[model samples]
Target: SPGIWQLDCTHLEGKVILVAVHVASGYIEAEVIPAETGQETAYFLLKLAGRWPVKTVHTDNGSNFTSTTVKAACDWAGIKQEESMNKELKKIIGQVRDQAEHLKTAVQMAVFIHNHKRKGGIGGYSAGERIVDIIATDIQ
Candidate 1:
């Protein structure tokens, strides 16, 4: 099945942000949290799963990712969770810090750019295009 993966988190000014990307499409989602906790991580995962056909999730071996609540949530959703290596997200975090005055707005715009910009790979289709196409076909 077409799915997304590469779940990860980063720290920013004493806050934690969770990020995930669709390997095939380059589509991404991010959430900011006051603190890192399993429940919060699980909540983000579940929210993403609701919107996309996310069958498998990949993450680092963080306590938040491994907590029972996260595991149970994944199990209930039939989403397989696994550990992996990763980080283009950190680069984005750095860029957001440098560029935007408001962290939340900057991060969101960065994600928008990441998804909407045309890529040289995947036959030059934008990540946003790929996701929209997938949804359009599925709906039809």
Candidate 2:
């Protein structure tokens, strides 16, 4: 199954949050990074690859996203890199930021809510279910 990973950074309550959203499933995973550098991004990607079959990564023209380290990580992981562009995500991130709570807890809540609480128009399935269906099929 082909999944596009859209990664972006947001400043939330003084912490830099790196969020990775899987396009096909709308499933999102996030990490709190010290900075928006390639090292940090690839660190996240490395962990992500261990969990998911990451194929294509989408991000803006930020130097970090285009850095040789990131390219090397993706290339070694057999992942394709693409340039891009978020909205509902901002709303979620904003709400979490407003709380000024534990960043990890806030991020975890955001991920769960975005992936489980909201349903996709397609067959009325949530992101969680969609990704489940996707990976399940991939396994067969």
Per-candidate RMSD vs. true structure? 3.3, 3.1
User: On residues 24-106, what C-alpha lDDT tens digit does candidate 1 reach at each position?
Assistant: 66778887787889999989888998888888987888889899999888988889988221255556656666677767766
Which pairs of residues have clashing backbones in candidate 2?
none
TM-score of every model versus the real structure:
0.80, 0.81
Each prediction's whole-model lDDT (CA):
0.77, 0.76
**At residue 73, what lDDT does model 2 achieve?**
88
Q: What stretches of model 1 exceed 4 Å from their correct place?
A: 83-101, 121-123, 134-140
Quote the positional error of residue 92 for candidate 1 in Å. 4.7
- Which consecutive 10 residues in model 1 have the weakest lDDT in total? 83-92
